[PDB]
Design a protein around this ligand. Structure first.
Ligand SMILES: *CC(=O)Nc1ccc(NC(=O)C*)cc1
Ligand SMILES: [Zn+2]
Lengths: 374, 13
């Protein structure tokens, strides 16, 4: 019910309201960016990171405190992704859908490195600086105490999502399916079992079990093997910026606070859009682009997040979009009835746009979905 | 048939 501008003013205000005087110096070189930053920030007291940041890129002498800070935040937000640290991995091909590495304990300091990354992200928000690390909306949901949903599974694992939907909409007592409330996990060669609930090894999934099994399994699909690393990140953040300060944001708004808003190239978008059952000459498609033309930039980004799962664009624009199974341009499909809302498949960067009866119908249903659904 | 897809679901989950 509250707008993003209002929420941004109310958060910034609360940061401005908890500031400290003076400054902190952080000295790094381009070649030891990560290690210098890690030590200096972690041997500092967390609240002191709310003071004015003086980042020294030792050797570079082009300066501007807010410009070197800007550059630092960017470079380091990438350097934490270095595979040598074994902290992160991708659920899909071509660096699609970042997630914490369950095997990260092969790095004996991983929990301390994650608490450092937590601090670094809170420093970015607190100082209004931007990062390009590429966290997913479910990761942001966790920062806002939002539980991942059935829809979210399709982003990380469309086949898992479809198997859960099938269970959700079939009769278990009619097909012979035998499942139990327990999951196998193999991390670094060690295979472990996790009970979804007490005694779940012996509890079989029935029609009367189903809904509970699905929501316990959904949570487990996002939390498995990364509980301790995730806790270390959240603590590191909370040390610097109380997580309580994010109470009003949703996950898509939080991603904008950390990534920054940039102006969306309308031509790049339309040239790189592909169509299923529709064409570029379809009634509803030409209506679609009128609704997008009438949107302000804030709402276009929101449309991008609804369909693709992020506001971030690759190098080379919309032609280079990535899905769960590889390259995957923005796509619009004729799916659904006139009584449905538009729904997205973020793994395929797809908008199921029903064959609406009027421009006014499409405009209201599109704007409603991009604002209230995911 | 429809136990082709239960086997597939069962392997995935
Ligand atoms: C025809 C038939 O019953 N097929 C079938 C159903 C389920 C499963 N697997 C499990 O229940 C785990 C295999 C085959
Ligand atoms: Zn996507």
């Amino acid at each position: 019910d509250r707008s993003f501008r209002w929420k941004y003013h109310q958060f910034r205000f609360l940061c401005h309201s908890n500031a400290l005087p003076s400054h902190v110096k952080i000295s790094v070189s381009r070649q030891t960016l990560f290690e210098d930053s890690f030590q200096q920030i972690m041997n500092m007291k967390p609240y002191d990171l709310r003071r004015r940041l003086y980042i020294i890129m030792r050797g570079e002498e082009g300066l501007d405190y807010g410009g070197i800070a800007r550059e630092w935040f960017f470079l380091l937000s990438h350097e934490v992704l270095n595979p040598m640290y074994c902290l992160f991995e991708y659920a899909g091909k071509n660096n699609y859908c970042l997630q914490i590495n369950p095997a990260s304990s092969i790095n004996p300091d991983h929990l301390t490195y994650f608490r450092f990354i937590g601090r670094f992200i809170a420093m970015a928000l607190y100082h209004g600086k931007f990062i390009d690390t590429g966290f997913t909306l479910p990761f942001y949901k966790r920062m806002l105490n939002k539980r991942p949903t059935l829809k979210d599974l399709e982003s990380i694992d469309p086949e898992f999502y479809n198997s859960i939907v099938w269970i959700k909409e079939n009769n278990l007592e009619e097909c012979g399916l035998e499942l139990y409330f327990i999951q196998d996990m193999e991390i670094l060669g060690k295979v472990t079992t996790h009970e979804l609930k007490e005694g779940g090894e012996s509890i079989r999934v029935t029609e009367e079990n189903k809904e509970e099994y699905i929501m316990l399994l959904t949570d487990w699909r996002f939390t498995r093997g990364v509980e301790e690393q995730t806790k270390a990140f959240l603590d590191g953040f909370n040390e610097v910026a109380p997580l309580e300060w994010l109470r009003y944001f949703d996950e898509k708004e939080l991603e904008l606070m950390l990534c920054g808003m940039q102006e969306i190239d309308m031509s790049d978008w339309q040239k790189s859009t592909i169509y299923r059952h529709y064409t570029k000459n379809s009634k509803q498609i030409q209506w679609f682009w009128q609704v997008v033309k009438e949107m302000d930039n804030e709402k276009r980004i929101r449309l991008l997040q609804f369909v693709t799962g992020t506001c971030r664009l690759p190098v080379g624009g919309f032609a280079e979009l990535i899905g769960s199974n590889g390259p995957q341009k923005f796509c619009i499909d004729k799916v659904g009835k006139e009584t449905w809302l538009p729904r997205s498949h973020t793994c395929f960067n797809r908008l199921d746009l029903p064959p609406y009866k009027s421009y006014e119908q499409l405009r209201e249903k599109l704007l409603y979905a991009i604002e209230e659904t995911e | 048939r429809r136990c082709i897809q239960a086997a597939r679901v069962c392997a995935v989950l």
